[PDB]
């Protein structure tokens, strides 16, 4: 019985957005559809994968009839997108098919009942706060690469969202590296730490432009919610014990190296060429104001990079996974970096020499 008529232009960004949590080969067919709900004067598009959901509300000016149904996401989007610019899309449910008409174009999509669509369990918020899109973007961007992908340690396959005082902190680690970023959000916050799943973190970052619209976050008992404009992202939290970043940070490195972020990044990128394809091992030789990067591969090929650094401390040698090091140098979009070395078998803390908002810890490899 549901019906609505809205401009193609309006329906495009919402369709692309709610078609976010939808992946590949969904076991349950209804996870490939989008829940369309016409109710008071707003059309609600919902897209889920059972663990997270994305709701987009679209204002309806034209006459419409209340109701709800689910329709295939790719087909419905590609249809709206394929229509000419400024098209009037008249959608009406007719039996077990949804009729999409726009000019001399007519489409009949197969629908699944709205009652069968998954609803994320109703819950109560505990921590609630607002911050700019740019702040959340920076917080996620600077730590997302360090998350574990498919580790048996389920709690590492995601990002920690910890609120401590004035700041919001994001921590991500995979057992080899650490990345921590904390920024003030002009608010008195309670100490609360939650693990947002890997996939949820990606879809959360994908709904942020730059700084365009404030982001209202609601952290509950086992869920997190993010309201930016007419979009409501909700995700279950990875219920586990995330490791303490403070224990991972080197307690006392005695050897501090300072160098140009870009010069250091290129030296590692060039050395990585003749490094082992699988292990990606490179040697660091820290001498007085000089760093030597050496890479070897099974084919007996060598790279050697010598760089002028600001080094103060004893001479030591440390092995590293050049990909883990380059990941940090690329995350640090800055002019100069600082490396805090302890010894050949301990972690090095790499961070921006100007700002300490973000810090990275990389575990070395056997020489």
């Amino acid at each position: 019985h549901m019906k609505f008529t809205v401009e193609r232009e309006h329906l495009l960004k919402p369709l692309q957005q709610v078609s976010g949590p939808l992946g590949g080969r969904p076991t349950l067919p209804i996870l490939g559809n989008l829940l369309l709900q016409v109710a008071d004067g707003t059309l609600s598009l919902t897209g889920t994968d059972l663990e997270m959901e994305m709701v987009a509300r679209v204002a309806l000016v034209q006459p419409h009839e209340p109701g709800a149904t689910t329709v295939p996401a790719r087909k419905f989007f590609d249809i709206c997108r394929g229509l000419p610019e400024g098209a009037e899309i008249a959608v009406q449910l007719e039996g077990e098919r949804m009729l999409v008409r726009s000019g001399r174009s007519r489409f009949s999509l197969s629908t699944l009942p709205a009652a069968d669509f998954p609803n994320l369990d109703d819950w109560q918020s505990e921590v609630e706060f607002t911050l700019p899109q740019a702040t959340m973007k920076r917080l996620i961007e600077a730590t997302q690469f360090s998350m574990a992908h498919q580790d048996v340690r389920y709690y590492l396959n995601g990002m920690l969202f910890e609120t401590e005082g004035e700041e919001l902190r994001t921590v991500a680690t995979d057992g080899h590296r650490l990345a921590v970023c904390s920024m003030p959000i002009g608010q008195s916050l309670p100490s609360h730490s939650v693990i947002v799943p890997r996939k949820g973190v990606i879809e959360l970052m994908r709904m942020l432009d730059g700084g365009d619209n404030p982001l209202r976050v609601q952290i509950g008992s086992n869920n997190i919610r993010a309201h930016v404009g007419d979009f409501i992202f909700t995700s279950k939290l990875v219920d586990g014990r995330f490791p303490d970043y403070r224990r991972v940070l080197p307690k006392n490195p005695d050897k501090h190296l300072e160098a140009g972020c870009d010069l250091l990044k290129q030296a590692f990128a060039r050395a990585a060429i003749l490094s082992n394809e699988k292990f990606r091992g490179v040697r660091l030789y820290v001498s007085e104001n000089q760093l030597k990067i050496t890479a070897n591969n099974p084919e007996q090929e060598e790279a050697e990079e010598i760089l002028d650094v600001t080094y103060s401390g004893a001479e030591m040698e440390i092995g590293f996974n050049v990909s883990y090091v380059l990941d940090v140098l690329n995350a640090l979009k800055c002019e100069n970096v600082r490396m805090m070395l302890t010894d050949s078998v301990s972690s090095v803390q790499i961070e921006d020499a100007a700002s300490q908002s973000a810090a990275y810890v990389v575990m070395p490899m056997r020489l």
Binding site: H176, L178, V248, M365, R366
Partner: peptide
């Protein structure tokens, strides 16, 4: 190799 961070 690689050393465990924890």
């Amino acid at each position: 190799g690689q050393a465990x961070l924890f």
